[PDB]
Scaffold this active site. Structure first.
Site, PDB file in Angstrom:
ATOM      1  N   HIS B 288       0.869  -1.184   0.000  1.00  0.00           N
ATOM      2  CA  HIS B 288       0.000   0.000   0.000  1.00  0.00           C
ATOM      3  C   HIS B 288       0.908   1.237   0.000  1.00  0.00           C
ATOM      4  CE1 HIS B 288      -3.140  -2.836   1.064  1.00  0.00           C
ATOM      5  NE2 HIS B 288      -2.555  -3.117   2.216  1.00  0.00           N
ATOM      6  N   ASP B 428       0.538  -2.180 -11.481  1.00  0.00           N
ATOM      7  CA  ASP B 428      -0.009  -3.406 -12.059  1.00  0.00           C
ATOM      8  C   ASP B 428      -1.207  -3.109 -12.958  1.00  0.00           C
ATOM      9  OD1 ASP B 428      -2.465  -4.644  -9.671  1.00  0.00           O
ATOM     10  OD2 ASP B 428      -1.517  -2.643  -9.690  1.00  0.00           O
ATOM     11  N   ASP B 430      -4.679  -3.005 -13.000  1.00  0.00           N
ATOM     12  CA  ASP B 430      -5.877  -2.957 -12.191  1.00  0.00           C
ATOM     13  C   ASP B 430      -7.071  -2.965 -13.150  1.00  0.00           C
ATOM     14  OD1 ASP B 430      -4.473  -0.696  -9.641  1.00  0.00           O
ATOM     15  OD2 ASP B 430      -4.451  -2.870  -9.855  1.00  0.00           O
ATOM     16  N   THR B 485     -11.327  -9.237  -3.679  1.00  0.00           N
ATOM     17  CA  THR B 485     -12.681  -9.771  -3.809  1.00  0.00           C
ATOM     18  C   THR B 485     -12.986  -9.924  -5.278  1.00  0.00           C
ATOM     19  OG1 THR B 485     -13.291  -8.287  -1.990  1.00  0.00           O
ATOM     20  CG2 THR B 485     -15.035  -9.647  -2.970  1.00  0.00           C
ATOM     21  N   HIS B 514      -5.179  -8.574  -8.447  1.00  0.00           N
ATOM     22  CA  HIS B 514      -6.493  -8.677  -7.820  1.00  0.00           C
ATOM     23  C   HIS B 514      -7.702  -8.609  -8.734  1.00  0.00           C
ATOM     24  CE1 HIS B 514      -5.895  -4.488  -8.450  1.00  0.00           C
ATOM     25  NE2 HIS B 514      -4.937  -4.440  -7.543  1.00  0.00           N
ATOM     26  N   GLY B 515      -8.876  -8.513  -8.114  1.00  0.00           N
ATOM     27  CA  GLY B 515     -10.139  -8.451  -8.830  1.00  0.00           C
ATOM     28  C   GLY B 515     -10.449  -7.078  -9.381  1.00  0.00           C
ATOM     29  N   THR B 516     -11.661  -6.918  -9.911  1.00  0.00           N
ATOM     30  CA  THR B 516     -12.084  -5.651 -10.532  1.00  0.00           C
ATOM     31  C   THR B 516     -12.587  -4.497  -9.670  1.00  0.00           C
ATOM     32  OG1 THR B 516     -14.082  -6.879 -11.132  1.00  0.00           O
ATOM     33  CG2 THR B 516     -12.499  -6.441 -12.864  1.00  0.00           C
TER      34      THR B 516
HETATM   35 MG   LIG Z   1      -3.065  -2.808  -7.637  1.00  0.00          MG
END
Ligand SMILES: [Mg+2]
Ligand SMILES: [Ca+2]
Ligand SMILES: [Ca+2]
Ligand SMILES: [Ca+2]
Lengths: 146, 735
Positions: B288, B428, B430, B485, B514-516
């Site tokens: 983060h 990344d 996203d 999620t 990760h997810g959307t």
């Molecule tokens: Mg990211």
């Protein structure tokens, strides 16, 4: 662990139907508090929940006894939303309403073959106010109501 | 888009049974060319003169070259084309005869002709050789120098070759031709007069009727869409703001097609684009920390936060450092910090970008340091030679905002584990959203289950059984320890994305972690531009939160693809307390829907928790309880509205029985609204709950017998003591 907002309701509703304003609700009274809240247990499942914690007039539940029992079927079920996303799905045109047209339409892309007769047949039974179309509300009803 | 408007149905048939005869003549396609150029044809009664509701002063008569040859006495006309934007053919008739001396109905053709023509093959595409040469048939091709029909004045110029040299000049003259050419090929009398006096134009018109009119009627239908559309700069013109890496995007271009599902990404920072191709792994959820956009580090997550965008934010950086620390603290062995080694190509990049300036050299302890320059005014930077590591320190006349001052130290960056090797981290991919086609979700469902559901008796339970199936295997999102999620397919599709960008040549692991963002319910964010890769391959990049919205509505939502939008939309997401707007249909139909028992009780509990006073207080005022009792009564009518047993009735009834159950509600509302001092906050609400009911009953009314306005139908009711006949009344009131 229902949010606080998940409490104000579960009370602002638990009371409204507390005629004899004490702070506990009868049987039929629980039955009612729930239905209104958009739910509805069975004529007999209404007991098992309340019927389990008898330390009152052997048939009455307090605010706590209630705000508590609200995780026997709440702390679990998160379906409300899926069902509202399923709705936005059929509503293929953005009119907030679902039509036999779009029902049948999407009913097929998912590989199902429905007869012009049996689709105008769904819509109908799903419609409660007769406007010939199903809105979220009635949709939510059709789905959840068992 | 009804092309032909018949103004006056005055006369019997004759007028009609005449206008038709006129149209059934002209080719169903020549028309569609019209109803494409946005034209409309007008058959009015006897509005002869400037009386047409569309014939006054706009773009009328400027330069006189009107009829076949010429005349220009407007007032004496019955046919006319409103020449300027959309074509508007306005025409009328009086009595019977047109055929006798068709010299009249022939103008309905040329008079028309000036419509399609100039936008027809003669000049739209340009005077394409097709008509550029048909023009040549002046006297060069066939021994037919017979054109003394359309070339009297403007082209008695036989002594001036007619090719490109001068055809531009009088495009309009070669109109006066495609006109009378058309008029002659379709006039009801002289068809061959254009098969004799003109040896080729017959063939031209014919070829046109052959399918030539279907031509432009398609090169227009197509530019019918491609024209008025949603600006989106497709192609590598977008893939440029995408940030994404071309070999990747292009790589993705395969998955969209195979699984038929839109793919949308937020913007991948440019100062990472290449670090990605370079092989730098990407930031997952574990980190983060803030990236950076300047200095040598740019595109890396400087373990040191006062070296990332937020340079100076004594507390953002403060909390910022605190973030990488835990990133490691908690998730160790996988998340840590390694030294910044700017490889080859990279340096030249931050160079022509202005991020860094490579200049003077220097020596220190025995190794070479080209000193790397950057307008930052507290930190200085130099890059080693042996290994191309990098270092910085606080200038000899400054300090670190947090309050630190140090000499040459290497620049470490955050790096995740990757096959047992702490690789550095950069932005990344996203995903902003994933739009699989509904058909692709059916494939997601296991044949047995679906079967077990459709092989049912209850026509309605079936639908339910299905929707849950479509919900279960396609709309549902469970949280994952690893990938944030996301749905399950969302995941399968998630691996296939990475695999695809790894069976190419990526060695940084996964590029989509990760997810959307459609599930980033907590800290949702609004990005103007959104890169989207259609189900076929085209790259696209919207420009506005709306356009994106507008796109998705046209191409995804109302187009057979399953899409769902961030739950925290239109609401106030907690994490960042940001309100992000998105068109929600269900809401677009609330304005007209009676609320629910619980939807009602909800809005109360709401206000309660705010102005801390409820619609009814816990007191002895028999007037208060009057109120309590009374809401319980609304929360009944409303609850009675939505009764599922309403089916054992029939549409007509439903509408009625409901308009009443409805009214019942609206009433006790009027009641409390005039009861005792219910806080002015509830006053409004109820005032809102009224308009609803209202709107709802008007609706249920306009579906059947509607002349009765809610406000009027109300008066007529007697909600005094008895309720009985009241309804029987209501009935008759609506018959
Ligand atoms: Mg990211
Ligand atoms: Ca009680
Ligand atoms: Ca709809
Ligand atoms: Ca309905």
């Amino acid at each position: 662990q229902l949010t606080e907002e998940q409490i104000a309701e579960f009370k602002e509703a638990f009371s409204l139907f507390d005629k004899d304003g004490d702070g506990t609700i009868t049987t039929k009274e629980l039955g009612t508090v729930m239905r209104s809240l958009g739910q509805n247990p069975t004529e007999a499942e209404l007991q098992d929940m309340i019927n389990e914690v008898d330390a009152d007039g052997n048939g009455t539940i307090d605010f706590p006894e209630f705000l508590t029992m609200m995780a026997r079927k709440m702390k679990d079920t998160d379906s409300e939303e899926e069902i509202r996303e399923a709705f936005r799905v059929f509503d293929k045109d953005g009119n907030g309403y679902i039509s036999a047209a779009e029902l049948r339409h999407v009913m097929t892309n998912l590989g199902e073959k429905l007869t012009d007769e049996e689709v105008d047949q769904m819509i109908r039974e799903a419609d409660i106010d007769g406007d010939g179309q199903v809105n979220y509300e009635e949709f939510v009803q059709m789905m959840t109501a068992k | 888009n009804n092309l032909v408007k018949t103004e006056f149905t005055n006369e019997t048939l004759d007028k009609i049974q005449q206008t038709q005869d006129l149209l059934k003549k002209i080719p169903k396609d020549v028309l569609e060319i019209y109803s494409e150029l946005g034209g409309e044809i007008y058959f009015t009664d006897i509005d002869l003169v400037e009386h047409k509701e569309l014939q006054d002063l706009s773009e009328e008569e400027k330069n006189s070259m009107n009829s076949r040859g010429e005349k220009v006495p407007f007032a004496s006309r019955f046919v006319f084309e409103k020449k300027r934007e959309t074509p508007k053919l306005i025409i009328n008739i009086k009595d019977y005869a047109i055929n006798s001396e068709q010299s009249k109905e022939v103008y309905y053709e040329i008079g028309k002709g000036i419509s399609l023509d100039i936008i027809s093959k003669d000049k739209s595409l340009d005077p394409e050789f097709l008509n550029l040469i048909k023009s040549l048939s002046d006297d060069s091709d066939s021994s037919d120098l017979l054109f003394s029909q359309k070339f009297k004045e403007k082209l008695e110029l036989n002594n001036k070759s007619i090719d490109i040299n001068f055809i531009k000049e009088n495009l309009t003259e070669f109109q006066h031709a495609f006109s009378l050419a058309f008029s002659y090929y379709f006039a009801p009398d002289h068809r061959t007069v254009l098969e004799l006096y003109a040896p080729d134009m017959f063939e031209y018109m014919n070829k046109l009727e052959k399918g030539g009119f279907e031509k432009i009627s398609e090169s227009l239908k197509k530019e019918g869409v491609e024209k008025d559309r949603i600006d989106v700069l497709k192609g590598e013109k977008a893939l440029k703001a995408s940030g994404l890496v071309p070999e990747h995007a292009d790589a993705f271009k395969k998955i969209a097609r195979e699984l038929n599902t839109y793919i949308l990404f937020r913007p991948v920072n440019k100062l990472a684009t290449n670090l990605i191709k370079s092989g730098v792994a990407t930031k997952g959820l574990n980190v983060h920390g803030k990236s950076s956009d300047w200095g040598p580090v740019a595109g890396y997550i400087p373990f040191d936060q006062d070296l990332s965008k937020k340079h100076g934010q004594q507390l953002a950086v403060e909390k910022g450092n605190l973030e990488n620390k835990k990133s490691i603290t908690e998730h160790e062995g996988e998340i840590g910090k390694i030294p910044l080694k700017l490889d080859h190509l990279r340096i030249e990049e931050l160079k022509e970008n202005g991020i860094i300036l490579k200049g003077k050299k220097e020596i220190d302890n025995g190794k070479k340091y080209y000193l790397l320059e950057s307008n930052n005014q507290v930190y200085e930077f130099r890059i080693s030679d042996e290994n191309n590591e990098v270092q910085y320190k606080t200038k000899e006349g400054k300090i670190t905002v947090l309050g630190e001052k140090f000499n040459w130290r290497n620049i470490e960056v955050m790096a995740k584990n990757v096959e047992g090797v702490l690789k550095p981290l950069t932005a990344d991919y996203d995903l902003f959203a994933l739009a699989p086609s509904l058909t692709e979700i059916k494939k997601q469902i296991p044949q047995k289950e679906w079967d077990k559901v459709v092989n049912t008796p209850n026509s309605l339970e079936k639908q339910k059984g299905v929707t849950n199936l479509l919900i279960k295997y396609g709309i549902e999102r469970k949280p994952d320890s690893t990938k944030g999620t996301l749905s399950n397919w969302q995941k399968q599709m998630l691996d296939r994305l990475n695999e695809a960008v790894k069976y190419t040549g990526y060695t940084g692991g996964d590029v989509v972690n990760h997810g959307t963002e459609q599930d980033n319910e907590e800290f949702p964010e609004k990005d103007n531009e959104i890169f989207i890769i259609n189900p076929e391959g085209e790259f696209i990049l919207t420009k506005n939160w709306e356009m994106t919205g507008r796109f998705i509505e046209k191409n995804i939502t109302g187009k057979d693809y399953l899409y769902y939008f961030n739950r925290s939309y239109n609401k106030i997401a907690p994490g960042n307390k940001a309100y992000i707007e998105w068109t929600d249909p269900i809401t677009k139909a609330k304005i007209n829907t009676i609320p629910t028992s619980a939807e009602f009780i909800k809005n109360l509990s709401s206000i309660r928790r705010s102005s801390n006073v409820g619609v009814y207080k816990d007191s002895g005022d028999k007037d208060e309880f009057a109120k309590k009792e009374s809401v319980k009564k609304i929360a009944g009518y409303l609850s009675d509205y939505y009764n599922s047993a309403n089916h054992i009735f029939s549409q007509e009834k439903k509408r009625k029985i409901s308009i009443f159950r409805g009214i019942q509600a609206y009433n006790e509302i009027e009641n409390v609204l005039k009861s005792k001092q219910i806080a002015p906050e509830y006053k409004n609400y109820f005032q809102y709950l009224k308009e609803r009911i209202t709107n709802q009953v008007q609706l249920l009314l306009t579906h059947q017998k509607s002349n009765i306005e809610f406000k009027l139908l109300y008066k007529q009711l007697n909600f005094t003591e008895n309720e009985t006949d009241n309804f029987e009344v209501f009935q008759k009131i609506i018959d």
